[PDB]
Design a protein around this ligand. Structure first.
Ligand SMILES: Cc1cc2c3c(c1C)C(C)(C)CC=[N+]3c1c([nH]c(=O)[nH]c1=O)N2C[C@H](O)[C@H](O)[C@H](O)COP(=O)(O)O
Ligand SMILES: Cc1cc2c3c(c1C)C(C)(C)CC=[N+]3c1c([nH]c(=O)[nH]c1=O)N2C[C@H](O)[C@H](O)[C@H](O)COP(=O)(O)O
Ligand SMILES: [K+]
Ligand SMILES: [K+]
Ligand SMILES: [K+]
Ligand SMILES: [K+]
Ligand SMILES: [Mn+2]
Ligand SMILES: [Mn+2]
Lengths: 500, 500
């Protein structure tokens, strides 16, 4: 099943005609990422590089653009839907609902099985060299070959009660180490802190690539502190994930992983990390910083292993479709659990997923007998003081008429219903997202503030009800007339397919 | 010539295949505007309604969407280019440059000719009734039949030295009066004030429809106080416009006007005006206000007269393409004349043309040795204290890499380079544009404040130079590689016409 096995997922993209197999030699030095980048910017088919120059002993093929968009609007999100056993015509609402479904279910803990495909081959300390593998250079000014753009890090709390699966970038440092970003408030960082305070040893670690697609989705999602992603994925799919034990430590990884690294995340060592062409669409050349250091002790991998790769930057790729959308889903639920009348949330791609649009049940809002300033501060306090809101710098509140999944309607509402200054509340005393250029390379503190809630609700939306009609075809003309016009459109001479 | 004669313009849209002639009966009550609205929302061909129910004695046909967009991106702006004798493939930059060209030339005053087509027919006090003409109801909740959406009002200063041509809405009040918006700081209002302070008589007035397309463009443009649009248009076209005298007053109107009303704008009377479905995409039903009152004494018109009509509201129509773009052109020049290093300006449609994006020569900016706060206040003071900035509530400053004519790149820069609050300056003590819902129906003063300058220049853009590369295909891969990828794109299996 595609959602439980990466190999089947690839086979599903083939059958969908959403794949291009490139069987001629492609250079992992920029070429593969450049092809992928172009795909992402044009919503083309996912590239499967079956012939990567320097592939040594079945390591490795590359699939690019695993969670990027399709050209048609009918199956725009079909690649994401293939992660989740959803029809390829699934709406964003449906995708996010599926990702949220597990949050009011008992986890389904994983099933330990004795072996599986990720054990078909192995290399030890003396047999692999990470500098010899065809690791991609993804952007020309990157400070390293970013092996890790679409695998999940697996770490466990010292007390064993919480095993976290998360995406965080990492690059090759030398023959048997990576460096990577490990930053608050991320769960990999929270657990890394637990181990540093215990002070006795380095963090047992695995990094799994070509994991079950439903797993990589949960990996990208800010599900709550203390919640083991394996069990959440279990509950969302309705089936216990099968895991196998690592050879060299006691962590468990999906049986069908394409590639597994086993080793340790250091509680004391660091190494040069970055720069990297990032989700907001920039790289700052030469901007290298000390990052987390990982020692790799073993590699296990499937026959004919495929490494997925996000060639991330300007729209549209996995950092937009998954980071933004999944943060927005958690934010939606968080608001609801704080008794806020939010029906829907989405991070507009046009905002480089730095905004989230929150659609409000204005019937409920009216019963609250509140004001803009009041509501804005409350919404901001809930979201910007919580980890789910880390990456989001602007919240835009909109009433019931706005479809938050439609950037054009969000932009309209923002531009026309929120008076700059007066209808906004700025937050300077919350954690900021330093990767946004205006934070980390901007004029203020990299780690603090720079957040706003912009209220695009109109005054009567708090009191008596929407008091306008839109000046559009839909709302400024009666139904019989609109039907007549639509019926006569081609007869009259105008131009007039859903799929295509 | 299309740019000097509305009839030739219509013939030019035909020949371009940018026209649909509807020769079957169409109801001016909503039907014509609904068809037009759909055209505007889908960038279809301009509708020419040759058969309007209730057309009486050659009054009148309607052309909708006269300055709206075409479907293709190659001739996106071709309808605007046909106003100006520019090729239909003209860029926005070229269109705005043409509209600005006259501002450093001597005016070419108009030529008085004894007659012309607008005199082929006439009706006096006792012969016309404005309530009987097929005046359109453009939106279902409009407070009147808006005869005037694409003609120009002609008024002259009491001292004769300044004759202003401007677009401002007006609706039928009764058999021989209109009401309309006349609001500061608009030139129709400035002149109306001159007459009110003289106090001796009502303002001699004409309202001309189906005027020379180059004239209607200048009508929409905030060219400077005291400047007679006829002479500016003369200089921009390189030819003196021919005008004929009104029968019942001493004003002059283009010889080829489709329809001319002659009469007076009252210095003392008002009447119910509005509501109207407006450029920002809304109508507030029942929101009727006292507006200017016009008495109509005579109608002259061409045989088979055509009335143009803007069915305005949500994107994209004349209120976006012309109001926004032409304000942005004047703002560009205004900045330049105040020694600000602005190269280009545009009002992003995504902002409902409430923003203007200002592209900065950052070499010049660097030589200025200034800061964000400083530059922002200066730019804001120049633009928001000037009439050219009236309709614009947010200025976004961007460096040299951004194409301000491309909404997607403006949105990117805004979202990623301007830190909310810190990188912005709010202006509460400037004139506001009350028609924006968040002004006139919002939480603050309808007429004051609500403006911001958002600085999307990055810190090093003021000091040493841009210090990033974009994480896009264009900038993160070397040229030989990009060329190779592009050359091999279809060979590999990916999808690959300018016109379509
Ligand atoms: C999809 C995706 C998510 C990335 C990501 C990428 C992708 C493709 C990359 C690898 C291409 C670019 C960088 N990424 C990082 C990242 N989070 C983080 O802390 N550091 C990162 O380097 N994220 C977001 C992160 O996975 C989410 O915030 C999760 O909620 C983290 O899981 P957690 O809640 O268990 O901590
Ligand atoms: C293209 C265009 C421009 C409208 C306009 C419309 C269109 C189609 C309408 C008619 C459909 C909707 C309303 N309009 C008004 C308007 N300006 C104004 O003061 N009142 C208006 O009612 N404008 C903008 C106005 O014409 C510009 O600001 C000019 O600069 C005014 O000329 P001026 O500088 O000589 O005063
Ligand atoms: K996660
Ligand atoms: K508001
Ligand atoms: K004008
Ligand atoms: K800035
Ligand atoms: Mn987690
Ligand atoms: Mn003027």
């Amino acid at each position: 099943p595609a959602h439980l096995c990466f190999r089947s997922f690839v086979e599903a993209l083939k059958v969908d005609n959403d794949l291009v197999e490139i069987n001629t030699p492609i250079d992992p030095n920029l070429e593969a990422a450049a092809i992928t980048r172009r795909v992402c910017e044009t919503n083309d088919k996912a590239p499967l590089f079956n012939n990567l120059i320097g592939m040594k002993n079945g390591l490795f093929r590359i699939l690019g653009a695993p969670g990027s968009l399709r050209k048609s609007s009918a199956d725009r999100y079909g690649r994401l839907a293939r992660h989740l056993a959803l029809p390829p015509t699934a709406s964003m609402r449906e995708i996010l609902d599926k990702m949220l479904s597990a949050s009011d279910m008992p986890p389904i803990p994983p099933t330990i099985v004795p072996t599986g495909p990720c054990k078909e081959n192995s290399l030890d300390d003396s047999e692999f060299d990470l500098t010899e593998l065809p690791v991609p250079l993804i952007h020309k000014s990157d400070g390293g070959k970013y092996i890790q753009t679409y695998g999940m890090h697996i770490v466990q709390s010292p007390d064993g009660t919480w095993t976290n699966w998360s995406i965080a970038r990492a690059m090759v440092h030398d023959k048997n180490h990576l460096t990577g970003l490990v930053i608050p408030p991320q769960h990999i960082w929270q657990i890394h802190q637990m181990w540093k305070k215990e002070g006795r040893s380095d963090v047992p670690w695995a990094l799994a690539f070509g994991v079950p697609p439903a797993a990589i989705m949960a990996s990208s999602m800010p599900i709550p502190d203390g919640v083991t992603e394996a069990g959440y994925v279990g509950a969302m799919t309705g089936s216990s994930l099968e895991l196998v034990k690592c050879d060299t430590n006691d962590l468990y990884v999906p049986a069908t992983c394409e590639i597994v690294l086993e080793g340790t995340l250091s509680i004391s060592e660091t190494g040069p990390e970055g720069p990297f062409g990032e989700m907001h669409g920039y790289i700052f050349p030469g901007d290298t910083h000390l990052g987390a250091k990982y020692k790799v002790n073993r590699i296990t991998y499937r026959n004919n292993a495929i490494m997925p790769m996000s060639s991330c930057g300007r729209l549209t790729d996995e950092t937009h479709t998954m980071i933004g959308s999944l943060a927005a889903a958690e934010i939606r639920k968080l608001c609801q659990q704080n008794d806020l009348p939010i029906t829907d949330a989405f991070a507009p791609f046009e905002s480089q997923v730095t905004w989230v649009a929150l659609r409000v049940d204005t019937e409920k809002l009216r019963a609250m007998k509140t004001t803009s300033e009041g509501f804005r501060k409350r919404v901001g306090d809930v979201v910007f003081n919580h980890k789910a809101g880390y990456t989001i710098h602007r919240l835009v509140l909109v009433g019931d008429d706005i479809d938050v999944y439609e950037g054009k309607d969000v932009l309209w509402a923002f531009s026309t219903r929120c008076r700059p200054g007066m209808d906004e509340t700025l937050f300077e005393d919350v954690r900021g997202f330093p990767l946004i250029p205006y934070m980390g390379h901007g004029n203020g503190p990299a780690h603090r503030g720079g957040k706003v809630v912009s209220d695009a609700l109109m005054p009567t939306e708090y009191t008596t009800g929407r008091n306008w009609e839109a000046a559009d075809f839909n709302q400024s003309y009666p139904e019989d007339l609109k039907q007549k016009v639509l019926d006569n459109w081609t007869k009259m001479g105008f131009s007039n397919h859903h799929h295509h």
